[PDB]
Paper text:
These two types differ in their resistance profiles, with type 1 enzymes conferring resistance to all tetracycline antibiotics including third-generation drugs while type 2 enzymes are generally limited to only first- and second-generation tetracyclines.
Tet(56-2) and Tet(56-3) were also identified in the genomes of Legionella species: L. clemsonensis and L. massiliensis, respectively. We determined the X-ray structures of Tet(56-2) at 1.80 resolution with Rfree/Rwork of 17.43/20.93 and Tet(56-3) at 2.39 Å with Rfree/Rwork of 21.69/24.85. The structures of Tet(56-2) and Tet(56-3) show that the FAD binds in an “OUT” conformation, a conformation that was previously confirmed in X-ray structures of other type 2 TDases. The FAD-interacting residues are conserved between both structures. This is much larger than that of Tet(50) (KM and kapp values of 3.57 ± 0.44 μM and 0.15 ± 0.02 min−1 respectively), suggesting that while Tet(56-2) has a much lower binding affinity for doxycycline, the turnover rate is higher. The addition of 1 μg/mL anhydrotetracycline reduced the concentration of tetracycline required to inhibit the growth of Tet(56-2) producing E. coli two-fold, from 32 μg/mL to 16 μg/mL. Apparent IC50 values for anhydrotetracycline inhibition of Tet(56-2) and Tet(56-3) were in the low micromolar range (0.3-30 µM) for tetracycline and doxycycline inhibition.
Numbering used by the authors: 3 to 387
The structure:
């Protein structure tokens, strides 16, 4: 209304809740720690109830226009021999409403829906304090600003969570694996083709799709090693290179091109476990509160649903945040649990055994496809108008 609402983080959840807040009569302000919007990341899937929300948000056609268009998927051994080849569907469309899109393309689409929302980059909070009346936010500039409501949308490593919640109110559960992805020059000359090689509890992929000049690389692997500083990019890259030192295939050609990449991403595959996602005038959304991990395939869809419900409950409560936050926690809990359980289930076998029976792999793959459809629909959305 006139309420001062700060949204921390311009990823998926933060821009999404800004759209809903703006639509529902509020005037949010958005901040991003980085200098500009971060567009790295693998393809993600808009699935289940999130496809309905994308439609209501007015972005479904735009997402469809930016769908991935891989025509040929090959699984190869470390010498490059093709073990199995899959081909895409006609027109690059599924028969259902699901759509695969690069994360960066989705983030661009979301930011276009909130052109009327102030967004400040290079803004980083160093201190947060709240009383019964205001949230006091001190920035690295030295600025100090008071807000009625602060929404943490700042990802699995949420600074907002760290500054507001006691360490015993949240756990980061490592699921035993890591993910890295980045773009490099398309030195193989791939054309709408994805190559993937799996060995020794490790997976390496490389594709080129809609930009013929660039290729996107992906690395996933099991490891119990924990970094000294999970945010230290030098340590991340050294760990990635050590891990794949003897993998062979294209791994050295890819890793040797990381200095030419402007969108490097690396993170542990982890869940955020909390009994409540709010404290006083502070609410967490998306990965900051309930990251289901990349192995769920659902982080962006949980972010969509969380943004919608929190914004709606704030509208229904006529800006009475205590009531809205209570409803938010209650209405989202079952859906978060279902999606997190599915991520845990996938983690129990992902890359765990070097060689798996074909019969076993096929039954596992079929069950996962059935389960993810159920999980993605496991909520009844409230209506807010
Ligand atoms: C660059 C990038 C690439 C990713 N690639 C993948 C991928 O390939 N696969 C996958 O499964 N998940 C990936 N993720 C995570 C994925 O986006 C989430 O799992 C989910 O889809 C969206 O959750 P989110 O918006 O809550 O968090 P995020 O997408 O992580 O967005 C958090 C945002 O908050 C910003 N931020 C962080 N700290 C602060 C701070 N202190 N102050 C202000 N802003 C801050 C970040 O810069 C970012 O823009 C990626 C995230 C990022 C940021």
């Amino acid at each position: 209304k006139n309420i001062k609402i700060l949204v921390v983080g311009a990823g998926i959840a933060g821009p999404a809740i800004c759209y809903w807040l703006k639509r529902f009569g509020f005037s949010p302000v958005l901040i991003e720690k980085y200098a500009s919007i971060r567009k790295g990341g693998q393809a993600l899937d808009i699935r289940g109830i999130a496809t309905h929300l994308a439609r209501v948000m007015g972005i479904y056609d735009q997402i469809c226009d930016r769908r991935t268009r891989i025509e040929c998927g090959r699984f190869v051994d470390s010498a490059g021999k093709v073990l199995h080849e899959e081909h895409g569907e006609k027109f690059g469309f599924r028969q259902d409403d699901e759509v695969e899109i690069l994360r960066g393309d989705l983030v661009e689409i979301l930011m276009k829906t909130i052109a009327d929302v102030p967004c400040y980059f290079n803004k980083s909070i160093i201190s947060m304090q709240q009383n019964a009346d205001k949230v006091i936010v001190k920035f690295k500039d030295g600025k100090i600003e008071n807000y009625d409501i602060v929404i943490g949308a700042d990802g699995i490593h949420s600074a907002t969570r760290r500054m507001i919640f006691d360490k015993n109110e949240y756990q980061l559960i490592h699921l035993g694996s890591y993910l890295s992805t980045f773009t490099i020059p398309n030195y193989l000359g791939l054309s709408h083709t994805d190559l993937e090689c799996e060995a020794n509890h490790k997976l390496v992929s490389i594709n080129s799709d809609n930009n013929p000049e660039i290729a996107r690389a992906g690395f996933m692997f099991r490891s119990q090693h924990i970094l000294k500083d999970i945010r230290d990019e030098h340590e991340q890259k050294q760990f990635l290179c050590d891990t794949f030192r003897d993998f062979g295939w294209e791994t050295q050609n890819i890793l040797n091109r990381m200095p030419e990449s402007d969108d490097f991403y690396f993170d542990a595959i982890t869940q955020v476990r909390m009994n409540s996602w709010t404290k006083g005038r502070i609410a967490l959304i998306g990965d900051a509160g309930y990251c289901p991990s990349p192995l769920s395939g659902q982080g962006n869809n949980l972010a969509f649903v969380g943004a919608y419900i929190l914004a709606g409950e704030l509208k229904t409560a006529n800006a009475n945040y205590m009531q809205a936050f209570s409803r938010y926690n209650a209405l989202l809990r079952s859906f978060v649990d279902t999606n997190q359980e599915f991520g845990v289930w996938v983690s129990k076998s992902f890359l765990v055994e070097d060689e798996v029976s074909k019969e076993i792999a096929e039954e596992r793959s079929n069950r996962i496809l059935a389960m993810i459809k159920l999980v993605s629909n496991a909520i009844i959305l409230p209506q807010y108008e």
